[PDB]
């Protein structure tokens, strides 16, 4: 199509950030030092992000181009193009809610001008000193 | 816009005052030689102090005369023969040789 | 084996770690202090992730360097917005060194065949599969990859009116990019047109250019109509013709058109005995009289012209009813001016003048405002070809004999010593100070420079190549001629102040080590400024 | 000379045991040779010299219907340690050709291409005499100097040129 | 003249050379011999000046030692830096790809005070890199060179800056040290230590220990001095000491005992505050205190500090006369940081010494702690000392440092001029952006020390200077120039090396001075240099010094530009630079017009092979020469043949001598790449014509005859290196082997049993060089695009072999590929006068314009590119070139012609191909050239080609006619530059794309596309070629669906599909989505999806 007249912005709500995301990363691991493969439910994870090689699952059961739009029961990776690894956004569920630094440490503070308080006091609230 | 931009931008290489004056005028900053303009139209009278120029402009309309005190002796008066006591100066024209502050010209002459 | 990992990974790791630990502390049922501390750590981790080195100290990994945040992708000169969006690498594009291509028409440019072949590889492959040269695409790809003899018959059939955008960095002005018809050339250089060199500000002193192949029909069109060099002769500055003759062409046409007394085949107008002699039935006759040793191109001859339109005053006095598609009228001109007007368009009137770069400027301006752009494009190309042809047989060549010195340079200089030394005789007594002396010296030696600057032109003959080059307006100034022959005069210090002892010697004579060493300042200063 | 093949060295950019000049400079000197052949087909000459002395162009042993026209010319200087065995391939052409690559043709790693100059003429010039004044039908007499390498005589060359021009003027 | 066995080059030298051209690698070798503490230096230090020599290492150890623990029970002092036998010879390091280094010992005595027993041992510091006689360091088998750094000398620099408010001259001094805190005194604010603003001078003056009376007595007739002690709030010593001590460091308990120790530790102490010998010297000589005293003195304790303030108040007051309490009288005047009296040159030795210092200081920590941790008595300096920090500090100095550059080996002269290079920039030096327009500019002190002409044309103009010919380095590091003294108008032959300081104290006349045979100013008034840069013209009585010979001020590179003084500094600079770009040519040939410096440059450059010992040549081979000495020994000089130089050029050395020649001590045996009979021969003598010719030579292009592509006169050998390593991975292990799974026989026919291409097999852009297999996948080394030709040698290093590989490698292989570059079109040529240009057209020799004898001219340069550019050097060089090529005889007369009155003897007659020397500033002249062109006619025919004006009647080969006016033909020596089409030409329809950035990976080597920048986009927008820009910044770069579809669409011959959205947008979108900025796409009616 390549036809969008205007471009609107805003603030990413947890709902919209969840709606964006395809899977939830829930382990602090990138790639295995031995084999150099992506780690399951970690960063670079094929299940949540996308497949390493073009039309190839993690475990290595479905590696054919013929089929598309199916999730492998063993690993849970979807067999599509690799380019999605530079598209399919992820997310992290914070056990405790965390504010954005841009609406806080900005000069003047947007949260600070919204809720009407000193930035030095707002610092103490966010950084658990009050 | 871009035609004009590039047209103005290109022959900066073929200059030597020069590109400083161009970028100073385009960036709309206060000049290196702050030569004031006439705030009101009237007749000029210049008193020569201890190595200083006291210019007073007596107005034609009927208000307060424009007075200046502390400007350097090596700024030089505008050639309009040359500016001395017993002359009538316009609100538009520059007073001394150098560069007229744009902000000053805008607020006075629109 | 070694990893060149991005910093984001470490921040995301730090966040997910502290998130997992916090979730484990929530699962455990821990006290408030450790949970609030872990929440502070998490808060600081996400804060650092979104903006590193904003609140207090930045996060660092190997060797005390701050981690590239998510916002650090966007901010800076190496930002996404700035670096990785405004200037990119491009496919279907080449770069090479430019050479002159004076055989080429303005709209044409010469492309190195070994470049061209690769630059149009798919386009030539398409036509190679269209023809029964290649059986399938892969064999065409292989054929063009191998550079087989059959490709060359096709590559012109493929390149036929498929223009290319030539660029010369830095791309200052709009014409700094121009579209051209790529003519194949054997070599590894881009044969640029001589006129467009000013439109690129491109010398042939190693300066590279970048070819781009516009692929889309729309692009091909845009190239052809908007920015094809022929279509935009006039600069987008003063609306003056930028693609006009400069350097050689100028001296070529200057020599071609300029008039000379006491020449070969000259107009005499003899009394009693002989006829007028310097009178010729046709420009053809005059050309035959020139090529055979009998007529000199720069002779005030009386030629009878048919194809050319006369001067505005001579239009009225002769015809003033019918036109001259094939009539006849007499002109007291130079063969060269007729060979010049032969280049200028049919319905354009006669000039009968020496073709100074300004005269060329106003002529090509008149052509630009009066005639279509194609007429200008072509006429200025004929002016280029003719100009260059006549640049050779101009006889513009430099020699130690050709570069002269003014014979009064001894008299006028030494006199200007007698005024200077005198000041010293005034100083030693104690009247004038060093600073006023230092200025009066500058005045005196500037006057001395001026005297030589004038005196040079009074002595130097007209045909003198040095005088040709400058007084044509081709290139160079009377300043450069004065600092080449006579003396450089006063040269400036690196502060801006002038040195009171000048260069009292021509570059022809050669400077003394000191006079040179003083000259170095202003030149290095100039190089540092440019 | 179109391609030379020294049995020892495997490429241009090395040296032979016990020679003064390097293989590049030997090739560069063998370009300086002047030879003439009857058969236009590629003919292989042989130059074999073992032990000390100055290898000249006269020491080359050409086959039947090939002649060297500068025996005096210095190629390489040897010692008792060094042995120079070089075969020089000659072919009849015209003008100049670039050093044709053996990778393109069906030629082995041993064969070294050399920048062939199929130009048996060395120099040509001319001046024209005005001879007689403008009155009584003036004519121009041209005198041309033709200077060959000794591959062929000026006569042969000028005749070949004249022949080429006569062939080249079609009507 | 002076050179033992050089080919006779007739000279246009009017004066006699007083001083011979000294060692052109002295500023490298001598400095490094001063660092090492070598015998040749030691003797020179014993002879010249002070009678107590100390080597760089001896000094840097002497200053450091003794190392001692906090208690002061055990200590450790070093001495005697002995240099034992070197690991291997220079060639073997370049062969084995190791470093050329000497094992370095130091005698170390572990002293124990409590017991009274000293344990002595020889400590092996490591394989310390040593210098070659060529003046280079071979690091990891690469000839690197340490460029000498220009800096502001340690000392006290007074300045005066104008105020915007008050408009008064405040006199601000800066006390720059070797290492420590930087003191500076102002007036209107006092002292400022490490940006400690507002600290009146009286507080430290008191705090050190001056009573308020002694300040009033010492200051004398000062106003601001009496103002500063009046303005001081903290009156008394301890009050002022506690006042300054708290202000110096915040958050520390301010005690007297700590303050009084810190005050005298920060300045007066030797260990904490690193005093400089050059500093002590400078402050002693300039302030005038400790006059006629020994060197290696202490720092500025008190006397210097009060003397500098005494100087400052006298400067601020404004009196030229001064008398110091204790010191001698000295004139008072401001100092300039650019002026060479203050601008010192720290050189290889000192730059290595400064890193040895830091290394041994990084060791001193480890030793100092190791002594406190380890038990007493049962410890030896073997175990205590760690060698790693020092060898690491040196390997760091030869591992990315701006003062340790690659040798530019484009030619000998490029290397030679890469040595004796004065760098303003680098660590412990001013930055490229920080450097102003004033410091870049030349200074009247530069004259005869740094070259005013030679400097790059890029952004480093003025900064990267080059040391002048006769200049040398003083032991301090001050650049000294030689002069001849003159006494009451009678010139002496006493060659004296003066520094930029004492220079300015004296009166120096220029070398072009009329002399009375022996030495006496025959001219009544001489042209002279006065105090500073006043090019005066004064009486002979007043003058005390004079320039030895002319071209003092010129660099070795710039000194090979014949008729330099007829050029401008710009084109001179351009030519001087171009000569350092000149490529080496297959045959190579010397200029028919050069300068005397070309004979000397080639031999000292070090690529030429010289005879150390006088003798007869026993036998000559292409590989090596063996000479039998008069001493009786046999020297076997090894030559290197088609060895790769740093900048991809040939290091091919030719033996010039025959198998029974006679060689004297210091005579050339074998030429290096750019040498013909032991003189610097970069380019070639081409028959130049000077006329504009049918467009091809327009806007400085150049046209040359196919003759050059035929004869291979300008042909170059270019050698490129291609490396690959069998590095270990976690899956398996890499191996260099012939067998590849996915190939044909044709692509592996050139390979051998090893699995690498055989020596001499011609390679094409794409062909396999090294067959390598990754655990199985093919990761073979392929020759890059725009590169082809023969393979010289394959240098292999295996795990099986004993050679040193880098950590995590099984088998390194390094392939040398040679290509024989013919001078094609677009390749850049240039004279020695800046007259550069690309090769326009290669005219088939016939059509090129020719001389009436038949000789067709080799190049044509455009006339129009002479007057505007202001370089008529090329024309004089062309003319004297013609005079040189064709033999000549100045038909003398009964008693000489008038034009040759000031002409050299034994240069009336000369034969064909007669090489000529013209001293760059005192060579051939206009009236000499004019008459000289009046030559004989040696063209085998008996007619002259040129005329008395040097303008030949050329014949047009194109048309056939003779040109209507006579053309300036002659023989200009022209150089092939390194700017070649084979490097610069790029092309890309489609190929491999980069992984991280989804645009074509940029590069000539990587088969890359060109950068379509912002300024290119502005021009495209200014046209309004929307679809063009929207193609270039989408399917022709970023768009992954576009880049694959466009190729298919073009090759099928369909419409180009509409460019969708670039990856450069998607990445920004996803980046802003990752920054939690909810960006969404929607039109007037209906919202879009990503
Ligand atoms: Mg340029
Ligand atoms: Zn799977």
Swiss-Prot record, chain C:
Residues holding Mg(2+): 203, 205, 207
Keywords: DNA-directed RNA polymerase, Magnesium, Metal-binding, Nucleotidyltransferase, Transcription, Transferase, Zinc
Swiss-Prot/TrEMBL GO biological process terms: DNA-templated transcription
GO molecular function term, any single one: DNA binding
Cellular component GO terms, alphabetical: DNA-directed RNA polymerase complex
Protein family: Belongs to the RNA polymerase beta' chain family.
Oligomer status and interactors: The RNAP catalytic core consists of 2 alpha, 1 beta, 1 beta' and 1 omega subunit. When a sigma factor is associated with the core the holoenzyme is formed, which can initiate transcription.
Entry function: DNA-dependent RNA polymerase catalyzes the transcription of DNA into RNA using the four ribonucleoside triphosphates as substrates.
Name of the protein described by the UniProt record: DNA-directed RNA polymerase subunit beta'
Gene that encodes the chain: rpoC
Curated annotation (Swiss-Prot), chain D:
Region (Alpha N-terminal domain (alpha-NTD)): 1-171
Family: Belongs to the RNA polymerase alpha chain family.
One term of GO molecular function: DNA-directed RNA polymerase activity
Keyword Nucleotidyltransferase: yes
Subunit text: Homodimer. The RNAP catalytic core consists of 2 alpha, 1 beta, 1 beta' and 1 omega subunit. When a sigma factor is associated with the core the holoenzyme is formed, which can initiate transcription.
Role: DNA-dependent RNA polymerase catalyzes the transcription of DNA into RNA using the four ribonucleoside triphosphates as substrates.
Keywords, sorted A to Z: DNA-directed RNA polymerase, Nucleotidyltransferase, Transcription, Transferase
GO cellular component: cytoplasm; DNA-directed RNA polymerase complex
Single biological process term from Gene Ontology: DNA-templated transcription
Keyword set includes RNA-binding: no
Signal sequence, start to end: none
Gene: rpoA
This protein's name: DNA-directed RNA polymerase subunit alpha
Origin superkingdom: Bacteria
Domain notes: The N-terminal domain is essential for RNAP assembly and basal transcription, whereas the C-terminal domain is involved in interaction with transcriptional regulators and with upstream promoter elements.
Swiss-Prot record, chain E:
Keyword Nucleotidyltransferase: yes
Catalytic activity, as annotated: RNA(n) + a ribonucleoside 5'-triphosphate = RNA(n+1) + diphosphate
Effect of residue 425 to P: Rifampicin (Rif) resistant
Domain of life of the native organism: Bacteria
Effect of residue 408 to V: Rifampicin (Rif) resistant
The family this protein is said to belong to: Belongs to the RNA polymerase beta chain family.
Purpose of the protein: DNA-dependent RNA polymerase catalyzes the transcription of DNA into RNA using the four ribonucleoside triphosphates as substrates. This subunit often mutates to generate rifampicin (Rif) resistance. Interaction with RbpA partially restores Rif-inhibited transcription; once the subunit is Rif-resistant however RbpA no longer stimulates transcription.
Assembly and interaction partners: The RNAP catalytic core consists of 2 alpha, 1 beta, 1 beta' and 1 omega subunit. When a sigma factor is associated with the core the holoenzyme is formed, which can initiate transcription. Interacts with RbpA, which partially restores Rif-inhibited transcription.
Protein name: DNA-directed RNA polymerase subunit beta
Species of the source: Mycolicibacterium smegmatis (strain ATCC 700084 / mc(2)155) (Mycobacterium smegmatis)
């Amino acid at each position: 199509v390549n036809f969008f007249d205007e471009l609107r912005i805003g603030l990413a709500t947890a709902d919209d950030i969840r709606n964006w995301s395809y899977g939830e990363v829930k382990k602090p691991e990138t790639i295995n030092y031995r084999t150099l493969k992506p780690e399951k439910d970690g960063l670079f994870c094929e299940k949540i992000f996308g497949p390493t090689r073009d039309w190839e699952c993690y475990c290595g059961k479905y590696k054919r181009v013929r089929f598309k739009g199916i999730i492998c029961e063993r690993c849970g990776v979807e067999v599509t193009r690799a380019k999605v690894r530079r598209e399919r956004m992820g997310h992290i569920e914070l056990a405790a809610p965390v504010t954005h630094i841009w609406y806080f440490k900005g000069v003047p503070s947007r949260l600070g001008y919204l809720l009407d308080l000193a930035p030095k006091d707002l610092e103490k609230i966010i950084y658990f000193a009050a | 816009g871009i035609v004009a931009a590039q047209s103005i931008g290109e022959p900066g290489t073929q200059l030597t005052g020069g590109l400083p004056r161009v970028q100073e005028l385009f960036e709309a900053r206060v000049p290196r030689n702050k030569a004031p303009i006439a705030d009101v139209a009237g007749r000029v009278r210049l008193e020569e102090s201890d190595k200083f120029f006291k210019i007073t402009i007596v107005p034609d309309d009927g208000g307060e005369e424009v007075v200046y005190d502390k400007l350097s002796k090596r700024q030089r008066l505008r050639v309009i023969g040359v500016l001395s006591d017993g002359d009538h100066v316009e609100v538009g024209d520059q007073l001394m040789e150098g560069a007229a502050d744009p902000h000053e010209v805008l607020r006075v002459q629109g | 084996g070694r990893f060149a990992t991005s910093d984001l990974n470490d921040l995301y790791r730090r966040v997910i770690n502290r998130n997992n630990r916090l979730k484990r502390l929530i699962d455990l049922g821990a006290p408030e202090i450790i949970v609030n501390n872990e929440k502070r750590m998490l808060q600081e981790s996400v804060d650092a992730l979104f903006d590193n080195g904003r609140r207090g100290r930045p996060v660092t990994g190997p060797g005390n360097r701050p981690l590239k945040s998510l916002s650090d992708l966007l901010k800076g000169k190496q930002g996404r917005f700035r670096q990785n969006l405004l200037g990119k690498r491009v496919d279907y594009s080449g770069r090479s060194v430019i050479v002159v291509g004076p055989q080429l028409k303005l709209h044409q440019c010469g492309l190195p065949k070994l470049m061209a072949l690769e630059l149009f590889k798919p386009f030539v492959m398409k036509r190679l599969v269209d023809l029964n040269h290649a059986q399938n695409i892969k064999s065409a790809k292989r054929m063009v990859e191998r550079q087989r003899p059959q490709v060359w018959d096709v590559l012109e059939e493929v390149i036929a009116e498929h223009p290319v955008l030539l660029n010369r960095a830095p791309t200052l002005h709009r014409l700094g990019i121009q579209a051209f018809e790529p003519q194949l050339v054997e070599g590894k250089a881009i044969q640029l047109h001589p006129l467009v060199c000013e439109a690129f500000n491109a010398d042939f002193d190693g300066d590279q250019m970048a070819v781009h192949l516009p692929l889309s029909a729309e692009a091909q069109a845009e190239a052809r109509i908007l920015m094809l060099s022929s279509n935009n002769i006039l600069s987008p500055a003063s609306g003056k013709p930028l693609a006009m003759p400069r350097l050689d062409m100028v001296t070529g046409l200057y020599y071609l058109t300029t008039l000379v007394e006491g020449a070969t085949g000259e107009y005499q107008a003899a009394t009693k005995d002989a006829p007028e002699q310097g009178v010729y039935s046709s420009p053809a006759e005059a050309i035959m009289a020139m090529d055979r040793g009998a007529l000199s191109v720069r002779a005030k001859i009386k030629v009878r012209l048919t194809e050319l339109r006369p001067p505005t005053d001579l239009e009225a006095q002769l015809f003033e009813n019918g036109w001259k598609p094939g009539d006849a009228w007499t002109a007291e001109t130079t063969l060269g001016r007729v060979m010049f007007n032969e280049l200028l368009p049919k319905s354009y009137p006669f000039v009968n003048e020496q073709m100074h770069k300004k005269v060329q400027a106003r002529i090509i301006n008149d052509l630009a405002e009066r005639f279509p752009m194609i007429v200008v494009a072509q006429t200025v190309d004929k002016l280029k070809d003719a100009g260059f042809y006549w640049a050779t047989r101009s006889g513009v060549t430099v020699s130690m004999a050709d570069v002269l010195v003014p014979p009064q340079k001894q008299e006028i200089l030494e006199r200007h010593e007698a005024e200077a030394d005198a000041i010293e005789r005034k100083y030693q007594r104690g009247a004038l100070n060093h600073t006023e002396r230092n200025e009066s010296l500058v005045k005196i030696w500037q006057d001395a420079t001026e005297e030589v600057g004038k005196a040079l032109e009074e002595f130097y003959p007209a045909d003198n190549p040095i005088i040709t080059i400058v007084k044509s307006g081709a290139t160079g100034n009377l300043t450069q001629t004065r600092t080449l022959a006579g003396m450089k005069g006063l040269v400036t210090n690196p502060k801006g102040e002038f040195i009171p002892r000048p260069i009292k010697s021509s570059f022809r004579e050669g400077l003394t080590v000191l006079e040179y060493f003083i000259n170095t300042h202003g030149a290095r200063k100039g190089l540092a400024d440019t | 000379v179109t391609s030379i093949r020294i049995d020892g060295v495997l490429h241009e950019f090395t040296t032979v045991p016990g020679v003064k000049e390097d293989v590049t400079d030997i090739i560069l000197n063998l370009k300086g040779l002047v030879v003439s052949s009857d058969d236009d087909e590629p003919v292989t000459m042989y130059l074999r010299k073992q032990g000390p002395g100055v290898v000249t162009a006269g020491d080359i042993v050409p086959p039947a219907g090939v002649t060297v026209h500068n025996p005096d010319m210095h190629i390489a200087t040897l010692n008792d340690k060094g042995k120079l065995e070089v075969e020089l391939v000659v072919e009849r052409g015209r003008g100049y050709v670039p050093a044709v690559q053996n990778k393109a043709s069906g030629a082995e790693i041993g064969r070294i291409p050399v920048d062939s100059i199929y130009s048996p003429v060395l120099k040509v010039t001319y001046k024209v005499e005005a001879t007689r004044v403008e009155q009584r039908t003036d004519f121009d007499k041209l005198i041309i100097d033709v200077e060959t390498k000794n591959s062929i005589s000026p006569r042969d060359a000028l005749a070949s040129a004249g022949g080429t021009l006569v062939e080249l003027f079609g009507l | 003249n002076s050179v033992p066995g050089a080919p006779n080059r007739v000279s246009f030298a009017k004066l006699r050379e007083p001083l011979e051209v000294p060692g052109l690698l002295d500023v490298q070798t001598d400095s490094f011999e001063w660092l090492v503490g070598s015998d040749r230096w030691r003797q020179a230090a014993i002879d010249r000046g002070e009678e107590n020599p100390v080597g760089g290492l001896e000094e840097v150890l002497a200053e450091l030692s003794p190392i001692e623990d906090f208690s002061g029970s055990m200590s450790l002092s070093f001495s005697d830096p002995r240099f034992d036998e070197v690991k291997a010879s220079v060639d073997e390091c370049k062969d084995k790809d190791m470093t050329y280094a000497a094992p370095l010992f130091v005698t170390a005595e572990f002293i124990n005070n409590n017991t009274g027993e000293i344990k002595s041992q020889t400590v092996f510091m490591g394989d310390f890199p040593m210098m070659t006689e060529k003046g280079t360091f071979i690091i990891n088998g690469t000839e690197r060179v340490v460029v000498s750094q220009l800096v502001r000398s340690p000392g006290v620099y007074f300045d005066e800056t104008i105020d915007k408010s008050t408009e008064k001259t405040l006199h601000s001094v800066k006390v720059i040290p070797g290492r420590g805190a930087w003191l500076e005194f102002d007036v209107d604010v006092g002292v400022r230590i490490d940006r400690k603003r507002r600290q009146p001078v009286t507080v430290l003056l008191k705090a050190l220990g001056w009573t308020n009376e002694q300040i009033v007595e010492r200051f004398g007739f000062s106003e601001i001095m009496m103002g500063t002690l009046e303005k001081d709030t903290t009156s008394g010593t301890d009050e002022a000491l506690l006042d300054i001590y708290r202000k110096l460091r915040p958050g520390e308990p301010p005690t007297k005992e700590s303050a009084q120790t810190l005050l005298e530790n920060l300045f007066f102490k030797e260990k904490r505050y690193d005093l400089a010998r050059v500093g002590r010297y400078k402050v002693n000589k300039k302030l005038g205190l400790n006059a006629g005293k020994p060197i290696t003195s202490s720092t500025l304790t008190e006397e210097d500090v009060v003397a500098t303030i005494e100087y400052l108040v006298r400067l601020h007051e404004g009196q030229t006369s001064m008398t110091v309490p204790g010191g001698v009288e000295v004139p008072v005047e401001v100092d300039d940081i650019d002026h060479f009296g203050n601008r010192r040159l720290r050189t290889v030795g000192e730059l290595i010494q400064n890193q040895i210092r830091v290394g041994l200081s990084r060791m001193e920590r480890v030793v100092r702690e190791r002594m406190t941790t380890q038990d007493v008595e049962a410890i030896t300096p073997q175990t205590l000392i760690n060698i790693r920090p020092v060898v690491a500090a040196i390997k760091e100095f030869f591992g990315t440092s701006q003062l340790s550059q690659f040798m530019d080996q484009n030619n000998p002269l490029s290397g030679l001029t890469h040595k004796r290079r004065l760098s303003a920039l680098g660590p412990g030096g001013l930055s490229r952006e920080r450097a102003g327009l004033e410091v870049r500019d030349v200074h009247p002190s530069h004259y005869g020390r740094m070259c005013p002409i030679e400097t790059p044309e890029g952004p480093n103009i003025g900064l990267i200077g080059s040391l002048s010919v006769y200049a040398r380095v003083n032991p301090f590091g001050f650049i000294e120039t030689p002069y001849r003294k003159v006494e009451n108008g009678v010139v002496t032959d006493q060659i004296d090396y003066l520094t930029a300081d004492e220079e300015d104290r004296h009166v120096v006349a220029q070398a072009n001075s009329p002399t009375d045979e022996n030495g006496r100013f025959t001219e009544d008034r001489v042209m002279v240099r006065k105090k500073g840069g006043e090019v005066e013209f004064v009486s002979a009585d007043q003058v005390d010094y004079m320039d030895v010979s002319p071209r003092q001020m010129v660099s070795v590179a710039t000194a090979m530009i014949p008729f330099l003084e007829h050029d401008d500094a710009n084109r001179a600079l351009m030519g001087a630079n171009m000569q350092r770009q000149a490529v080496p040519l297959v045959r190579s040939e010397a200029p028919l017009v050069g300068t005397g410096m070309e004979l000397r440059a080639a031999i000292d450059a070090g690529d030429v092979v010289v005879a150390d010992k006088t003798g007869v040549i026993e036998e000559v081979s292409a590989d090596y020469i063996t000479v039998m000495a008069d001493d009786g020994t046999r020297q076997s000089y090894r030559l290197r043949k088609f060895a790769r130089s740093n900048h991809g050029t040939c290091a091919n050395q030719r033996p010039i001598v025959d198998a029974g020649q006679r060689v004297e001590a210091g005579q050339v045996i074998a030429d290096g790449p750019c040498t013909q009979n032991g003189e610097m021969a970069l380019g070639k003598n081409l028959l130049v014509a000077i006329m504009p010719w049918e467009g091809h030579n327009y806007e400085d292009a150049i046209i040359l005859s196919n003759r050059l592509v035929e004869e291979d006169v300008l042909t170059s050998i270019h050698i490129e290196e291609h490396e690959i390593d069998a590095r270990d991975t976690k899956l398996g292990a890499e191996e260099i082997t012939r067998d590849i799974p996915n190939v044909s026989d044709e692509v592996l026919a050139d390979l051998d049993e090893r699995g690498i291409v055989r020596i001499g097999a011609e390679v094409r852009d794409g062909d396999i060089l090294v067959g390598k297999v990754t655990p199985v996948r093919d990761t073979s080394l392929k020759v890059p695009h725009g590169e082809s030709g023969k393979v010289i040698g394959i240098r292999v290093f295996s795990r099986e072999d004993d050679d040193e590989l880098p950590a995590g490698v099984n088998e390194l292989v390094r392939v040398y590929v040679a290509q024989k570059r013919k001078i094609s079109d677009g390749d850049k040529l240039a004279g020695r006068h800046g007259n550069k240009g690309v090769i326009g057209k290669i005219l088939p020799v016939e059509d090129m314009p020719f001389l009436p004898d038949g000789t067709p001219v080799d190049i044509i340069l455009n006339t129009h590119g002479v007057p505007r550019r202001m370089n008529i050097g090329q024309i004089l060089e062309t003319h004297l070139g013609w005079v040189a090529k064709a033999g000549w005889n100045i038909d003398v007369a009964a008693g000489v012609p008038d034009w040759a009155s000031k002409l050299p003897e034994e240069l009336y007659s000369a034969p064909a191909d007669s090489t000529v020397a013209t001293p760059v500033f005192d060579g051939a002249q206009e009236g000499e050239l004019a008459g000289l062109l009046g030559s004989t006619l040696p063209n085998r025919d008996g007619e002259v080609m040129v005329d008395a004006d040097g303008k030949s009647t050329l014949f047009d080969g194109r048309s056939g006619e003779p040109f209507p006016y006579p053309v300036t033909v002659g023989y200009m020596y022209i150089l092939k530059l390194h700017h070649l089409v084979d490097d610069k030409i790029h092309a890309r329809s489609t190929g491999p794309y980069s992984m991280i950035t989804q645009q074509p990976l940029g590069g000539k080597a990587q088969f890359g596309g060109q950068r379509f920048g912002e300024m290119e986009c502005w021009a495209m927008q200014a046209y309004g070629a929307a679809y063009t820009l929207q193609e270039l910044l989408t399917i022709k770069s970023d768009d992954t669906v576009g880049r694959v579809k466009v190729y298919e669409a073009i090759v099928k011959g369909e419409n180009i599909p509409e460019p969708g959205i670039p990856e450069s947008f998607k990445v920004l979108l996803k980046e802003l989505q990752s920054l939690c900025l909810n960006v969404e796409v929607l039109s007037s009616d209906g919202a879009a999806i990503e």
